[PDB]
Design a protein around this ligand. Structure first.
Ligand SMILES: N=[N+]=NCCCCNC(=O)[C@@H]1[C@H]2[C@H](O)[C@@H](O)[C@H](O)[C@@H](CO)[C@@H]12
Ligand SMILES: [Cl-]
Ligand SMILES: [Cl-]
Length: 443
């Protein structure tokens, strides 16, 4: 038996573009994901978020799935261009009406909402003016954040500013694989900096607008291990963890500068007087959300950019090709405790894509996702026993959804979605997870 502490929060998560559909309904502006996904070559099979799971219409059913399973929290995101179609200015009252209903229904069913302000659907109008690359995004971001705090902050007490600013900056502006689809390292390191400026302004504004709330920020994390015991590979790891994981952002938030290795690689790519913004950046946060999926073996390589390369291993992998290493989640949780000692941590997303099929019985037998989930939950349990202040754990995702540049070829849900019909079927992992929730852990 591995029983979690009293009042531990068991959650599921989603993001707005991945599940809602109806991106230009009821007054909404275009986002950078509507434009990107409508560009040929960007997304496998030419999928887009145009219909998705049609949550825009099916929300009440989907809430009803959460309640029926007895899951107690629900992290979802808010689409900025549904709220402000031009990014700033006139409010789209029908965008508010969409989220108010959701939120009211969660509250009447006893489900604690956790709201992500930004999970990648930047308004297109703001992209035309530089998007994340423009220092003025901090002000666009605060204006937008305040509309949300003012309209929902009476009922929503648990807030996340950014989902995975590493991904927004680096995948969106250096690799060019996510919206806005750009490949320029100098812009990329501007976006990193500006996401920090933006976060910190929203938290400021949070303190002036919400009573009795908590506000945090979410980071992607991988478990980097070294390829040999060479000090060069052990240093490859130190760089990967500083660059790709939470420190890239927590060194500034808790220390007042970028991490050391990061600065060795990149000082030239960051704005001139970047350090002048650091004081404002240390606006006090209430928690750290960690997202965790996979592990990577890493070596020093001088040919490679940033002098590091990945090394394939023969471990089980998911449909994404992600090596499954459940002790990574224990390690990231001990390390964030040891490094920056935040007063509260959540696991804001953990889960896995496998090629789910429906059987002749009309069920989805996904023991592969149960195995994955059990091993990670057991590992998180162990981190709590060792003193990590882990307050909750959210499964990515409630529903099969639009998996970014992968389209609908990758199914991460605990609820199967037939896209022909929009039928929801609860997977075996959904039923399992429901009993984890009931028993407050593993049995
Ligand atoms: N090198 N490197 N890092 C690249 C991998 C970073 C992890 N982030 C993501 O892929 C997105 C994040 C998002 O919250 C969610 O909307 C996505 O559905 C999941 C993907 O299943 C994860
Ligand atoms: Cl528009
Ligand atoms: Cl600028």
């Amino acid at each position: 038996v591995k029983k979690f502490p009293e009042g531990f929060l068991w959650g599921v998560a989603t993001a707005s573009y991945q599940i809602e559909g109806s991106p230009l309904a009821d007054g909404a502006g275009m986002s950078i994901w509507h434009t990107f996904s409508h560009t040929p070559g960007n997304v496998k099979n030419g999928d887009t978020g145009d219909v998705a799971c049609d949550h825009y219409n099916r929300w009440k059913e989907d809430i009803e799935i959460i309640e029926k399973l007895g899951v107690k929290a629900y992290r979802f995101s808010i689409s900025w261009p549904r709220i402000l179609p031009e990014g700033t200015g006139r409010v789209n009252q029908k965008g508010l009406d969409f989220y108010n209903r959701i939120i009211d229904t969660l509250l009447e069913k006893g489900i604690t909402p956790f709201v992500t302000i930004y999970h990648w659907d930047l308004p297109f109008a703001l992209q035309l003016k530089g998007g994340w690359a423009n220092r003025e995004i901090a002000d666009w971001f605060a204006e937008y954040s305040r509309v949300l705090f003012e309209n929902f902050g009476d009922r929503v007490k648990n807030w996340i500013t950014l989902n995975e600013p590493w991904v927004v900056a680096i995948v969106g502006h250096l690799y060019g694989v996510h919206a806005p689809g750009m490949r320029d390292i100098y812009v990329a390191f501007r976006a990193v900096h500006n996401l920090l400026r933006a976060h910190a302004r929203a938290v400021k504004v949070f303190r002036e607008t919400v009573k009795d709330g908590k506000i945090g920020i979410v980071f992607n994390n991988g478990y980097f291990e070294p390829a040999s015991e060479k000090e060069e590979d052990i240093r490859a790891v130190r760089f990967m963890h500083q660059f790709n994981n939470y420190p890239l952002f927590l060194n500034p938030i808790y220390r007042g500068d970028y991490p050391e290795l990061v600065l060795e690689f990149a000082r030239e790519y960051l704005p001139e007087n970047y350090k002048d913004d650091m004081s404002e950046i240390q606006e006090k946060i209430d928690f750290v959300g960690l997202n965790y999926y996979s592990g990577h073996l890493v070596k020093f390589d001088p040919d490679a950019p940033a002098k590091v390369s990945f090394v394939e291993r023969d471990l089980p992998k998911t449909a994404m090709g992600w090596e499954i290493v459940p002790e990574g989640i224990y390690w990231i949780l001990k390390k964030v405790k040891e490094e920056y000692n935040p007063p509260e941590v959540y696991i804001t997303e953990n889960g896995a894509a496998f090629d789910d099929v429906v059987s002749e019985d009309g069920r989805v037998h996904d023991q592969n996702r149960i195995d994955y989930l059990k091993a990670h939950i057991g590992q998180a349990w162990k981190a709590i026993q060792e003193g990590v202040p882990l307050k909750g754990y959210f499964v990515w995702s409630l529903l099969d959804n639009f998996e970014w540049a992968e389209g609908y070829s990758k199914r991460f849900g605990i609820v199967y979605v037939d896209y022909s019909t929009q039928k929801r079927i609860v997977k075996d992992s959904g039923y399992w997870y429901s009993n984890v929730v009931k028993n407050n852990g593993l049995e």
